[PDB]
């Protein structure tokens, strides 16, 4: 095909096609699976070995990977990759903090306190003091991660008019404005389908804004 119809290539008679002189060649670590019937999985799907690929269940999956349906080549390709859950930022840290039984870790650290090594006993004590602080207080560790940033009352960060009729204001307003602009831009970038690099940069800038 081409931009305009008078540039296309239509086959004059019956024949077979041969590709030569590629611009660049791509070597993937994938697995080919040609198909003949209605394919059951679309592009981007993640699939494990033994999963239905196409043709009502005839051709199935052999390796772990990600699906690349190829309607030109009529092959359901699969590139080796696991659905590994790995995150970044205060989101991951808050997850790990939420999934933390304090008594279990207290028991592990008490077991560590009987070790012959002096440094290991010391580090177990240092960890256990934080653990027991959270236990005796009743505070969840995850609260060290913010979801709802508080806002100071406005009279404690005023926007006042000086005698000259001009305005003078507190720095906390500009720091909050930084925070709100970055937060709103992140919410909009998530509303749309922004790629990984952009969302990562935005989240980093948001964390540094809170800082």
């Amino acid at each position: 095909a081409a931009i305009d119809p008078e540039e296309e290539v239509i086959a004059e008679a019956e024949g077979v096609v041969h590709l030569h002189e590629p611009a660049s060649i791509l070597v993937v670590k994938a697995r080919v699976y040609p198909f003949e019937d209605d394919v059951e999985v679309s592009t981007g799907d993640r699939v494990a070995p033994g999963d239905v690929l196409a043709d009502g269940g005839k051709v199935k999956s052999d390796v772990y990977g990600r699906v690349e349906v190829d309607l030109v080549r009529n092959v359901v390709r699969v590139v080796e990759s696991y659905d590994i859950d790995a995150r970044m930022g205060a989101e991951a840290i808050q997850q790990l903090l939420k999934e933390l039984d304090l008594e279990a870790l207290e028991k592990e650290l008490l077991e560590e306190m009987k070790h012959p090594s002096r440094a290991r006993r010391a580090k177990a004590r240092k960890r256990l003091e934080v653990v027991r602080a959270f236990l005796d207080s009743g505070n969840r560790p995850e609260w060290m991660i913010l979801e709802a940033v508080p806002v100071l009352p406005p009279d404690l960060r005023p926007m006042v008019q000086v005698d000259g009729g001009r305005f003078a204001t507190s720095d906390l307003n500009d720091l909050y404005r930084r925070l709100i602009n970055r937060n709103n831009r992140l919410k909009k970038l998530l509303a749309q389908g922004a790629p990984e690099i952009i969302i990562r940069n935005e989240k980093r800038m948001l964390q540094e804004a809170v800082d």
Binding site: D38, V39, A168, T169, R185, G193, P195, I197, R204
Partner: protein
């Protein structure tokens, strides 16, 4: 360590496109949009919901959130329902779902490839009120717009069409965010025009222009008072934490007296005023004192009408007005005699 260094390193990972790869990505994006339109034709669903489901499946379950324009809260259960409604299609119909999936997958890499152009453009907009990284992110938003608005049939490279939307987004961000007291974008345009006019006038006059010379050079509708009002309306605030002195122990805010909260003298004078008013009202009868208290608001805040006070005391509005008049007259007589309320009138 340095977030700009980190971003410029992440950007250097996605390689630049050769013309062929660029045209191929743009073509896949356009055909994917067409396929989403065709899928909306077939299913009868909303095209935005379909695009969101395809986008979710291409990005994964890592990002699934409610979209404002969508009538339904986009959760993995509903996206699975809609992906099943899309999976139960004939072959010549499900081919459109395949095309849409690959189109979204191409849009992602089309953005990521040209992320470098945004940096190379935004480095020239520093100093104008926004951080380098804020400019970069706004330029990336413009790049997303340019991706979704490109047309590869015109045979123009992507940079030519992308630079327009990138500049547009950076300039709109600067206009919308760089002021603590937000000013509408048209007024920012006017204030910038005023600044540039004054600058050219000083470059030709050897001194700063007056209001009248700027009004001259601005054209019709601009007098000196309008220039003065425009300059006044564009004054940015100053920090209350502005340093005063070489020692680090004085802030500009430390010298701004608080005018809102009443002073001790003000509160004491109001208290003595209320007490003297009660002393003067007790010299009336209960009814006329109550009539004045109801007519002026010393009872329930607001001021009642003659009809309300008359229906409350059970007399005619003329009678309540007559007893209000005689109450005021007795108060005037007592005030002329004792003069115990004059000093409160200033």
């Amino acid at each position: 360590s340095d977030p700009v260094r980190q971003y410029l390193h992440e950007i250097g990972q996605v390689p630049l496109l050769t013309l062929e790869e660029e045209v191929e990505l743009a073509r896949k994006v356009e055909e994917g949009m067409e396929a989403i339109k065709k899928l909306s034709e077939i299913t009868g669903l909303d095209p935005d919901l379909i695009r969101e489901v395809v986008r979710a499946k291409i990005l994964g379950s890592a990002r699934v959130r409610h979209i404002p324009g969508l009538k339904e809260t986009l959760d993995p259960k509903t996206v699975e329902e809609i992906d099943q409604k899309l999976k139960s299609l004939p072959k010549e119909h499900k081919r459109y779902l395949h095309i849409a999936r690959e189109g979204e997958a191409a849009r992602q890499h089309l953005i990521e490839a040209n992320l470098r152009l945004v940096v190379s453009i935004a480095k020239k907009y520093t100093g104008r009120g926004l951080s380098f990284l804020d400019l970069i992110q706004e330029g990336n938003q413009g790049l997303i717009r340019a991706v979704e608005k490109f047309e590869y049939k015109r045979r123009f490279k992507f940079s030519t069409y992308a630079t327009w939307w990138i500049r547009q987004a950076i300039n709109r961000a600067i206009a919308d965010q760089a002021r603590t007291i937000r000013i509408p974008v048209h007024m920012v345009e006017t204030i910038n025009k005023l600044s540039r006019t004054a600058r050219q006038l000083q470059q030709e006059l050897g001194r700063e222009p007056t209001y009248e010379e700027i009004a001259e050079a601005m054209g019709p509708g601009w007098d000196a008072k309008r220039v003065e009002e425009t300059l006044k309306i564009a004054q940015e605030p100053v920090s209350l934490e502005t340093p005063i002195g070489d020692e680090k122990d004085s802030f500009y805010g430390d010298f701004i007296p608080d005018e809102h909260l009443p002073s001790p003298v003000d509160a004491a004078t109001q208290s003595l005023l209320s007490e003297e008013l009660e002393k003067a009202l007790s010299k009336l009868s209960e009814r006329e004192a109550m009539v004045l208290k109801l007519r002026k608001g010393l009872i329930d805040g607001r001021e009642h009408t003659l009809e309300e006070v008359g229906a409350f005391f059970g007399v005619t509005r003329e009678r309540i007005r007559q007893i209000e008049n005689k109450a005021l007259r007795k108060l005037k007589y007592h005030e002329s005699r004792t003069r115990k309320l004059r000093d409160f009138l200033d």
